[PDB]
């Protein structure tokens, strides 16, 4: 009906604004902020190469103008933070990231040597004669466009392109130091190059150079560029001089600040070891699990919930290793985003397959995405099955099966999760993992993998929710039940946390639930297309929580009068999630476990330090409140969980 | 000396010429010749007329093998390495797409303007000097330089194939650039291009078809292809059907049929010789250690931390099982990439302790140690792994190395102690059997030499057998001279750079063999005759005061027999290297194939 919806990209840009804000948070240790600057840059790179590109491919066959307008604004904010706060704060703590060329003799002597012995051999000085010689400018790299005037006083300017060899040198170059010195010194690689251009072009007067960067859909030449970003001091004559070979309208050209590709800030060294950066605490264990005779025995006796970064990642692989050398185990089956890197998990699985046990890995990746690693695994006896086009398996489940009679119920352990088991990222992910021996779940997971492995099985699950099967109905039923309850004069409440909410249908149901008097708390960090503070969303509160850990859990709580039901999911509610992929959602059956999740989510909804509420103009508004005691959810959750573990 | 080892490189080229050898074997020898003539020209010529005459006719020998024999032979076995652009449309289409999508974005076309703009030429890299006319009218020439981006792409490009096709098709990377020059220079009639290659600017191998004026626009003129040592990289479509460099990896069938590897080692010492055997035992043993409840800790030396390997995944698994896992890496890169940082961070997150070599004492000793749990002030009991090579095999050229796997209580305690010395722990620095560089090693070697000299003075035979990569040190060359005059017989098996001259008053007793074979002989072994009660050493280096090195005695008699057997195969007469009587009626073989036949035989006993 007549329902409002944010555009998804505007909503996305709102998210990256909040990332930029972490950088502006002066209460945070500098390197925390620097990390977020880098993240912001890498996110906007991804957005450009898939999302802006998409809209550019459509406009061949306003959104684009809106993006550009917003990005130009965010860019200005970025440089204000960088020059007015970051660089100054670094100096307050003895770090000098030089933005101009050193005057100090020793530093000069050093860099001149460095340029000569280390940089220069990695250069490729390219004169640009546009119609005469063709040249490529690779994406994700930084290049210097140099303007040259020769011997003759003639106005005619020459132009040259050179590389900043960050494929062979660091972006940031440390300058030698004495303990008596006030600072540690750093220089941009491209700055050093700028300061020595005269040796590269001896027969010219080097007029100026400007940093450029191009993002493109892929690095290729056409057979007979989503972004072209450059230092704003650059005259258009030289722009149209590289456009003289690129056919690039002033639409993709965005003039920006003096340093580009600043996602490399993630590479800026902190010479004060653990200082200048929030120390992440030591990951907790479960005492209960630890004091069982073996891990598999523990899960056989009780369900466990593991909340990671707070708890270790170690339980998945430890369990896998137990299972490897156990006589009782017939098979192990799990999902994996890719098989490309070596991992503990792969190793535990290889051991198991070599121990004769049936080992299957269902991998959600593509046609044209490793080869040696897969063959090593197959040789070990592991089986690897891919999602052939249509449904890609986004589900995050593992399965350990015991030897059982014949027509008996499968017995074993199911592991279900909001993210991947393999920790392989520099950013730390907050995620939630259920470990259960429950015979209904274990059977459902059992059945799921047979279905994914193409075997005949009835499309029917006891407790599990699978996408393109029972999940759509279940989500509708659950929401509807809250609507009904309000009409019976009972409380109607929902607590919903995910990375993204974008699906028009589910959003419309939510609006109808609000209209019906159902109260809704949404905790959504990324894209949200539901628009808050509206008549149709009058009973909805929208919280975006962004902090050091990536809030990646997907969790659903339906009040149901007071017989609360909690689900853990692999899916956000996008269009592609509820229809294209195979996903999972799982009921948390154990009451104390369900209670914990709600406790945690309540901690999140109580956050007054990082949490932001969204308004109808897509603004990130901090939920700060001096009157109440300060609570930041990522600190508090750790204290809560550590608390309970001392109560063993 | 130099005339003799230029005639050593003659003997390699001789093998390549050998028309009864399998094509890819011949191709690998040509490849060895090209890498050897190179090394010469950095360590010998840079350090002149007498060189040129004999080299330039070898260069003529080489190219004759290559063009007249190697190329058609491949064709005859259904391998088509083209020297020209394809006429076949499918191929023509492919390379054109390949050029645009893969090669072009990796290109840096630079017009050469010699005094206006300065530019560097990287050594070891192949470039294309390109000669341009902007129009056929001009008569004069523009010039340009082009990279051949073999750092991002292979030197030989395979063209797509149908099972029905007669051949496998390959093209040189630079030739594809040659054919597509006009996309790079649309404004010119692209007159020519020539392969160039520099050494350092001491040398300048280049395409002989190149004029000197363009040479002056920036010197040993050769054929149409430079850096032909790349011919090793050229793949063999037919598994191991046309080579000998990859026979079936051997298993230790005894160890294979023990109830576990850890059980096996616990009961007997084992030797593992690589290419010959599987590389898997170390990884598989490490995994057994990772799942085992008995294992208390795992220590290991590493060169760098760079590759995320099977071994890393294992140690991670061990650390996550709660075991102490420390890793001793000797070099940290200066211009640190994030992939190093990421891998190391993941390992740190997993429980693994990265400990970098504390100054001076870089560990070069490539060892591992698996420790069990033991009662009180008990002796450390476990497994120790000591090797001649690096634990992480990420090689292009194939190295042969030897690994001891022992649970011997003396060595295990010795390796234990060594790690604690590397872990900066104050320790009673006294090793029972092991010999450690800035500790007992120099004294011990000296005695070992002085016991043979002693034995000569006692009327008994004095004998040493040493296998080495090379021997530079003056003090020890003279130490070997000291033993030589004092009546001690000496065998030197070496490969690379060595300056000890034979055939003199101080070297009548020093014979020096240099093997002519495919794998890089990396083992470093010391054999002391000791009046017939023989002593053998596995060693991490060759002759002692800079880093920390290890020499390990081979205590087990049968393993000592084994190594001596191997070494002696490398010393026999029917094997290719360089009063008595025999005839010219036995077919010479290669040491490595003989060694393989030997180790295979041993296993099926």
Short mmCIF file of N, CA, C and O in Angstrom, two decimals, chain B residues 163-259:
data_model
loop_
_atom_site.label_atom_id
_atom_site.label_comp_id
_atom_site.label_asym_id
_atom_site.label_seq_id
_atom_site.Cartn_x
_atom_site.Cartn_y
_atom_site.Cartn_z
N UNK B 163 40.10 -32.14 -26.63
CA UNK B 163 40.66 -33.49 -26.57
C UNK B 163 41.01 -34.07 -27.93
O UNK B 163 42.01 -34.77 -28.06
N UNK B 164 40.20 -33.72 -28.92
CA UNK B 164 40.42 -34.13 -30.31
C UNK B 164 41.67 -33.49 -30.96
O UNK B 164 42.19 -34.04 -31.92
N UNK B 165 42.12 -32.35 -30.44
CA UNK B 165 43.31 -31.68 -30.99
C UNK B 165 44.55 -32.58 -30.90
O UNK B 165 44.67 -33.40 -29.98
N UNK B 166 45.45 -32.41 -31.86
CA UNK B 166 46.67 -33.20 -31.96
C UNK B 166 47.66 -32.78 -30.88
O UNK B 166 48.36 -33.62 -30.30
N UNK B 167 47.71 -31.49 -30.61
CA UNK B 167 48.73 -30.96 -29.74
C UNK B 167 48.23 -30.35 -28.44
O UNK B 167 47.02 -30.19 -28.19
N UNK B 168 49.22 -30.03 -27.62
CA UNK B 168 49.11 -29.00 -26.62
C UNK B 168 49.85 -27.80 -27.21
O UNK B 168 50.87 -27.96 -27.89
N UNK B 169 49.30 -26.61 -27.00
CA UNK B 169 49.84 -25.40 -27.60
C UNK B 169 50.38 -24.41 -26.57
O UNK B 169 49.70 -24.08 -25.59
N UNK B 170 51.61 -23.95 -26.80
CA UNK B 170 52.22 -22.94 -25.95
C UNK B 170 52.84 -21.81 -26.76
O UNK B 170 53.30 -22.02 -27.89
N UNK B 171 52.84 -20.62 -26.16
CA UNK B 171 53.47 -19.44 -26.74
C UNK B 171 54.25 -18.70 -25.68
O UNK B 171 53.87 -18.72 -24.51
N UNK B 172 55.36 -18.08 -26.10
CA UNK B 172 56.14 -17.21 -25.22
C UNK B 172 55.34 -15.96 -24.90
O UNK B 172 54.68 -15.39 -25.78
N UNK B 173 55.42 -15.54 -23.64
CA UNK B 173 54.66 -14.39 -23.17
C UNK B 173 54.98 -13.15 -24.00
O UNK B 173 54.06 -12.46 -24.44
N UNK B 174 56.27 -12.91 -24.24
CA UNK B 174 56.73 -11.73 -25.02
C UNK B 174 56.28 -11.71 -26.48
O UNK B 174 56.05 -10.65 -27.06
N UNK B 175 56.16 -12.89 -27.08
CA UNK B 175 55.67 -13.01 -28.44
C UNK B 175 54.21 -12.52 -28.60
O UNK B 175 53.85 -11.95 -29.63
N UNK B 176 53.40 -12.74 -27.57
CA UNK B 176 52.03 -12.25 -27.59
C UNK B 176 52.01 -10.71 -27.57
O UNK B 176 51.19 -10.08 -28.24
N UNK B 177 52.93 -10.12 -26.81
CA UNK B 177 53.10 -8.68 -26.81
C UNK B 177 53.55 -8.24 -28.20
O UNK B 177 52.99 -7.29 -28.77
N UNK B 178 54.52 -8.95 -28.77
CA UNK B 178 55.01 -8.68 -30.13
C UNK B 178 53.90 -8.61 -31.16
O UNK B 178 53.88 -7.70 -31.99
N UNK B 179 52.97 -9.55 -31.08
CA UNK B 179 51.88 -9.63 -32.05
C UNK B 179 50.85 -8.54 -31.86
O UNK B 179 50.07 -8.27 -32.77
N UNK B 180 50.87 -7.89 -30.70
CA UNK B 180 49.82 -6.95 -30.36
C UNK B 180 50.36 -5.56 -30.10
O UNK B 180 49.65 -4.67 -29.63
N UNK B 181 51.64 -5.39 -30.43
CA UNK B 181 52.30 -4.09 -30.38
C UNK B 181 51.44 -2.90 -30.86
O UNK B 181 51.43 -1.85 -30.22
N UNK B 182 50.72 -3.08 -31.96
CA UNK B 182 49.90 -2.00 -32.52
C UNK B 182 48.74 -1.53 -31.63
O UNK B 182 48.20 -0.45 -31.85
N UNK B 183 48.37 -2.31 -30.61
CA UNK B 183 47.38 -1.79 -29.67
C UNK B 183 48.04 -0.86 -28.66
O UNK B 183 47.41 0.08 -28.17
N UNK B 184 49.32 -1.10 -28.40
CA UNK B 184 50.09 -0.29 -27.45
C UNK B 184 50.54 1.02 -28.11
O UNK B 184 50.45 2.10 -27.53
N UNK B 185 51.00 0.90 -29.35
CA UNK B 185 51.38 2.06 -30.13
C UNK B 185 50.45 2.20 -31.34
O UNK B 185 50.82 1.79 -32.45
N UNK B 186 49.24 2.75 -31.14
CA UNK B 186 48.41 3.02 -32.32
C UNK B 186 48.97 4.09 -33.27
O UNK B 186 48.72 4.03 -34.48
N UNK B 187 49.74 5.04 -32.75
CA UNK B 187 50.23 6.15 -33.58
C UNK B 187 51.45 5.89 -34.44
O UNK B 187 51.95 6.80 -35.10
N UNK B 188 51.93 4.65 -34.46
CA UNK B 188 53.18 4.32 -35.14
C UNK B 188 52.98 3.15 -36.07
O UNK B 188 52.05 2.35 -35.89
N UNK B 189 53.84 3.03 -37.07
CA UNK B 189 54.05 1.75 -37.73
C UNK B 189 55.14 1.06 -36.90
O UNK B 189 56.31 1.47 -36.92
N UNK B 190 54.75 0.05 -36.13
CA UNK B 190 55.65 -0.65 -35.22
C UNK B 190 56.70 -1.45 -35.99
O UNK B 190 56.45 -2.58 -36.41
N UNK B 191 57.87 -0.85 -36.18
CA UNK B 191 58.87 -1.41 -37.09
C UNK B 191 59.49 -2.74 -36.65
O UNK B 191 59.71 -3.63 -37.47
N UNK B 192 59.78 -2.86 -35.36
CA UNK B 192 60.39 -4.06 -34.84
C UNK B 192 60.31 -4.06 -33.33
O UNK B 192 59.85 -3.10 -32.73
N UNK B 193 60.76 -5.16 -32.73
CA UNK B 193 60.96 -5.27 -31.29
C UNK B 193 62.01 -6.33 -31.05
O UNK B 193 62.08 -7.30 -31.80
N UNK B 194 62.83 -6.14 -30.01
CA UNK B 194 63.86 -7.11 -29.66
C UNK B 194 63.93 -7.39 -28.15
O UNK B 194 63.94 -6.46 -27.34
N UNK B 195 63.96 -8.67 -27.80
CA UNK B 195 64.26 -9.17 -26.45
C UNK B 195 65.60 -8.67 -25.88
O UNK B 195 66.65 -8.91 -26.46
N UNK B 196 65.56 -7.99 -24.73
CA UNK B 196 66.79 -7.64 -24.02
C UNK B 196 66.71 -8.06 -22.56
O UNK B 196 65.63 -8.28 -22.01
N UNK B 197 67.88 -8.16 -21.94
CA UNK B 197 68.01 -8.66 -20.59
C UNK B 197 69.36 -8.18 -20.03
O UNK B 197 70.39 -8.31 -20.70
N UNK B 198 69.35 -7.62 -18.83
CA UNK B 198 70.58 -7.09 -18.24
C UNK B 198 70.97 -7.83 -16.97
O UNK B 198 70.14 -8.45 -16.30
N UNK B 199 72.26 -7.74 -16.64
CA UNK B 199 72.79 -8.29 -15.41
C UNK B 199 73.52 -7.19 -14.66
O UNK B 199 74.01 -6.23 -15.28
N UNK B 200 73.58 -7.32 -13.34
CA UNK B 200 74.30 -6.38 -12.47
C UNK B 200 74.57 -6.98 -11.08
O UNK B 200 73.64 -7.37 -10.37
N UNK B 201 75.68 -2.24 -14.04
CA UNK B 201 75.21 -2.89 -15.26
C UNK B 201 76.35 -3.65 -15.98
O UNK B 201 76.91 -3.14 -16.95
N UNK B 202 76.66 -4.85 -15.50
CA UNK B 202 77.79 -5.63 -16.02
C UNK B 202 77.57 -6.30 -17.39
O UNK B 202 78.47 -6.30 -18.24
N UNK B 203 76.37 -6.85 -17.61
CA UNK B 203 76.12 -7.61 -18.84
C UNK B 203 74.76 -7.27 -19.49
O UNK B 203 73.90 -6.62 -18.88
N UNK B 204 74.58 -7.73 -20.72
CA UNK B 204 73.51 -7.25 -21.58
C UNK B 204 73.22 -8.27 -22.69
O UNK B 204 73.54 -8.02 -23.86
N UNK B 205 72.63 -9.40 -22.33
CA UNK B 205 72.21 -10.38 -23.31
C UNK B 205 71.02 -9.82 -24.09
O UNK B 205 70.08 -9.28 -23.49
N UNK B 206 71.07 -9.94 -25.42
CA UNK B 206 70.01 -9.38 -26.27
C UNK B 206 69.81 -10.12 -27.60
O UNK B 206 70.64 -10.92 -28.02
N UNK B 207 68.68 -9.81 -28.25
CA UNK B 207 68.32 -10.38 -29.55
C UNK B 207 69.32 -9.95 -30.63
O UNK B 207 69.42 -8.77 -30.96
N UNK B 208 70.05 -10.93 -31.16
CA UNK B 208 71.10 -10.68 -32.17
C UNK B 208 70.64 -9.96 -33.42
O UNK B 208 71.46 -9.37 -34.13
N UNK B 209 69.34 -9.98 -33.68
CA UNK B 209 68.76 -9.25 -34.82
C UNK B 209 68.68 -7.75 -34.55
O UNK B 209 68.23 -6.99 -35.42
N UNK B 210 69.11 -7.32 -33.37
CA UNK B 210 69.00 -5.91 -32.99
C UNK B 210 70.17 -5.06 -33.46
O UNK B 210 71.33 -5.37 -33.20
N UNK B 211 69.87 -3.96 -34.18
CA UNK B 211 70.87 -2.95 -34.54
C UNK B 211 71.58 -2.35 -33.33
O UNK B 211 71.07 -2.39 -32.22
N UNK B 212 72.77 -1.80 -33.54
CA UNK B 212 73.56 -1.29 -32.44
C UNK B 212 73.14 0.12 -32.04
O UNK B 212 73.41 0.55 -30.92
N UNK B 213 72.49 0.84 -32.95
CA UNK B 213 72.08 2.23 -32.68
C UNK B 213 70.98 2.30 -31.63
O UNK B 213 70.89 3.26 -30.86
N UNK B 214 70.15 1.26 -31.59
CA UNK B 214 69.10 1.13 -30.58
C UNK B 214 69.70 0.53 -29.29
O UNK B 214 69.17 0.73 -28.19
N UNK B 215 70.81 -0.18 -29.43
CA UNK B 215 71.62 -0.62 -28.30
C UNK B 215 72.23 0.62 -27.66
O UNK B 215 72.29 0.74 -26.43
N UNK B 216 72.66 1.55 -28.51
CA UNK B 216 73.19 2.85 -28.09
C UNK B 216 72.10 3.76 -27.50
O UNK B 216 72.40 4.71 -26.78
N UNK B 217 70.85 3.44 -27.79
CA UNK B 217 69.73 4.20 -27.26
C UNK B 217 69.45 3.82 -25.81
O UNK B 217 68.50 4.32 -25.21
N UNK B 218 70.28 2.93 -25.27
CA UNK B 218 70.19 2.50 -23.87
C UNK B 218 71.58 2.24 -23.28
O UNK B 218 72.57 2.20 -24.01
N UNK B 219 77.77 -6.62 -23.67
CA UNK B 219 76.63 -6.82 -24.55
C UNK B 219 76.79 -8.06 -25.42
O UNK B 219 77.47 -8.03 -26.44
N UNK B 220 76.15 -9.16 -25.01
CA UNK B 220 76.30 -10.43 -25.70
C UNK B 220 75.08 -10.78 -26.55
O UNK B 220 74.06 -11.26 -26.03
N UNK B 221 75.19 -10.54 -27.86
CA UNK B 221 74.11 -10.83 -28.80
C UNK B 221 73.90 -12.33 -29.02
O UNK B 221 74.85 -13.06 -29.35
N UNK B 222 72.66 -12.77 -28.85
CA UNK B 222 72.31 -14.18 -28.94
C UNK B 222 71.12 -14.40 -29.87
O UNK B 222 70.92 -13.63 -30.80
N UNK B 223 70.33 -15.44 -29.60
CA UNK B 223 69.22 -15.84 -30.47
C UNK B 223 68.01 -14.92 -30.41
O UNK B 223 68.15 -13.71 -30.24
N UNK B 224 66.82 -15.49 -30.54
CA UNK B 224 65.61 -14.66 -30.52
C UNK B 224 64.85 -14.67 -29.19
O UNK B 224 63.84 -13.97 -29.04
N UNK B 225 65.35 -15.45 -28.23
CA UNK B 225 64.70 -15.58 -26.93
C UNK B 225 65.73 -15.48 -25.82
O UNK B 225 66.72 -16.20 -25.85
N UNK B 226 65.50 -14.59 -24.87
CA UNK B 226 66.38 -14.45 -23.71
C UNK B 226 65.81 -15.13 -22.48
O UNK B 226 64.63 -15.48 -22.45
N UNK B 227 66.66 -15.31 -21.48
CA UNK B 227 66.28 -15.88 -20.19
C UNK B 227 65.71 -17.28 -20.34
O UNK B 227 64.75 -17.65 -19.64
N UNK B 228 66.32 -18.04 -21.24
CA UNK B 228 65.87 -19.40 -21.58
C UNK B 228 65.91 -20.39 -20.43
O UNK B 228 65.42 -21.51 -20.56
N UNK B 229 66.47 -19.98 -19.29
CA UNK B 229 66.38 -20.77 -18.07
C UNK B 229 64.91 -20.96 -17.68
O UNK B 229 64.57 -21.92 -16.97
N UNK B 230 64.06 -20.06 -18.16
CA UNK B 230 62.60 -20.19 -18.02
C UNK B 230 62.03 -21.48 -18.62
O UNK B 230 60.97 -21.91 -18.23
N UNK B 231 62.75 -22.08 -19.57
CA UNK B 231 62.33 -23.33 -20.20
C UNK B 231 62.01 -24.44 -19.20
O UNK B 231 61.32 -25.39 -19.54
N UNK B 232 62.51 -24.30 -17.98
CA UNK B 232 62.16 -25.20 -16.90
C UNK B 232 60.69 -25.06 -16.60
O UNK B 232 60.00 -26.06 -16.44
N UNK B 233 60.21 -23.81 -16.55
CA UNK B 233 58.82 -23.46 -16.22
C UNK B 233 57.81 -23.97 -17.24
O UNK B 233 56.60 -24.01 -16.97
N UNK B 234 58.30 -24.31 -18.44
CA UNK B 234 57.44 -24.85 -19.50
C UNK B 234 56.91 -26.21 -19.08
O UNK B 234 57.69 -27.13 -18.83
N UNK B 235 55.58 -26.35 -18.99
CA UNK B 235 54.94 -27.53 -18.44
C UNK B 235 54.94 -28.75 -19.35
O UNK B 235 55.05 -28.62 -20.56
N UNK B 236 54.83 -29.92 -18.73
CA UNK B 236 54.73 -31.20 -19.42
C UNK B 236 53.30 -31.71 -19.32
O UNK B 236 52.89 -32.25 -18.29
N UNK B 237 52.52 -31.55 -20.41
CA UNK B 237 51.10 -31.93 -20.51
C UNK B 237 50.83 -33.38 -20.11
O UNK B 237 49.73 -33.71 -19.65
N UNK B 238 51.84 -34.23 -20.27
CA UNK B 238 51.66 -35.67 -20.11
C UNK B 238 52.25 -36.16 -18.81
O UNK B 238 53.34 -36.74 -18.78
N UNK B 239 51.49 -35.92 -17.74
CA UNK B 239 51.86 -36.23 -16.36
C UNK B 239 53.38 -36.36 -16.25
O UNK B 239 54.06 -35.36 -16.54
N UNK B 240 53.91 -37.56 -15.87
CA UNK B 240 55.36 -37.71 -15.90
C UNK B 240 55.85 -38.57 -17.08
O UNK B 240 56.88 -39.23 -16.96
N UNK B 241 55.12 -38.54 -18.19
CA UNK B 241 55.37 -39.49 -19.28
C UNK B 241 56.59 -39.12 -20.13
O UNK B 241 57.18 -39.99 -20.78
N UNK B 242 57.00 -37.86 -20.12
CA UNK B 242 58.14 -37.47 -20.97
C UNK B 242 59.34 -36.92 -20.18
O UNK B 242 60.24 -36.30 -20.74
N UNK B 243 59.33 -37.17 -18.87
CA UNK B 243 60.41 -36.74 -17.99
C UNK B 243 60.82 -37.83 -16.99
O UNK B 243 60.29 -38.95 -17.01
N UNK B 244 61.77 -37.50 -16.12
CA UNK B 244 62.19 -38.38 -15.03
C UNK B 244 62.28 -37.61 -13.71
O UNK B 244 62.63 -38.17 -12.68
N UNK B 245 61.95 -36.33 -13.75
CA UNK B 245 62.12 -35.48 -12.57
C UNK B 245 61.02 -35.69 -11.52
O UNK B 245 61.12 -35.16 -10.41
N UNK B 246 59.99 -36.46 -11.85
CA UNK B 246 58.91 -36.74 -10.90
C UNK B 246 58.46 -38.20 -10.94
O UNK B 246 57.41 -38.50 -11.51
N UNK B 247 59.24 -39.11 -10.33
CA UNK B 247 58.76 -40.49 -10.20
C UNK B 247 57.82 -40.61 -8.98
O UNK B 247 57.72 -39.66 -8.19
N UNK B 248 57.14 -41.75 -8.83
CA UNK B 248 56.22 -41.94 -7.70
C UNK B 248 56.91 -41.70 -6.38
O UNK B 248 57.90 -42.36 -6.08
N UNK B 249 56.41 -40.71 -5.61
CA UNK B 249 56.93 -40.47 -4.26
C UNK B 249 56.90 -41.74 -3.43
O UNK B 249 55.90 -42.47 -3.43
N UNK B 250 58.00 -42.02 -2.75
CA UNK B 250 58.11 -43.23 -1.96
C UNK B 250 57.51 -43.02 -0.59
O UNK B 250 57.65 -41.94 0.01
N UNK B 251 56.84 -44.05 -0.09
CA UNK B 251 56.45 -44.10 1.31
C UNK B 251 57.42 -44.98 2.10
O UNK B 251 58.00 -45.93 1.56
N UNK B 252 57.62 -44.63 3.37
CA UNK B 252 58.29 -45.51 4.33
C UNK B 252 57.30 -46.55 4.84
O UNK B 252 56.56 -46.30 5.80
N UNK B 253 57.29 -47.73 4.21
CA UNK B 253 56.21 -48.70 4.42
C UNK B 253 56.18 -49.29 5.82
O UNK B 253 55.14 -49.76 6.27
N UNK B 254 57.32 -49.25 6.49
CA UNK B 254 57.43 -49.65 7.89
C UNK B 254 56.65 -48.68 8.77
O UNK B 254 55.80 -49.07 9.58
N UNK B 255 56.95 -47.39 8.59
CA UNK B 255 56.31 -46.29 9.29
C UNK B 255 54.84 -46.23 8.93
O UNK B 255 53.98 -45.99 9.77
N UNK B 256 54.56 -46.46 7.66
CA UNK B 256 53.19 -46.53 7.20
C UNK B 256 52.38 -47.63 7.89
O UNK B 256 51.17 -47.49 8.08
N UNK B 257 53.04 -48.72 8.28
CA UNK B 257 52.32 -49.83 8.89
C UNK B 257 52.53 -49.95 10.40
O UNK B 257 52.15 -50.94 11.02
N UNK B 258 53.12 -48.92 11.00
CA UNK B 258 53.12 -48.79 12.45
C UNK B 258 51.70 -48.36 12.85
O UNK B 258 50.97 -47.85 12.00
N UNK B 259 51.30 -48.56 14.12
CA UNK B 259 49.93 -48.14 14.47
C UNK B 259 49.70 -46.61 14.35
O UNK B 259 48.58 -46.17 14.08
#
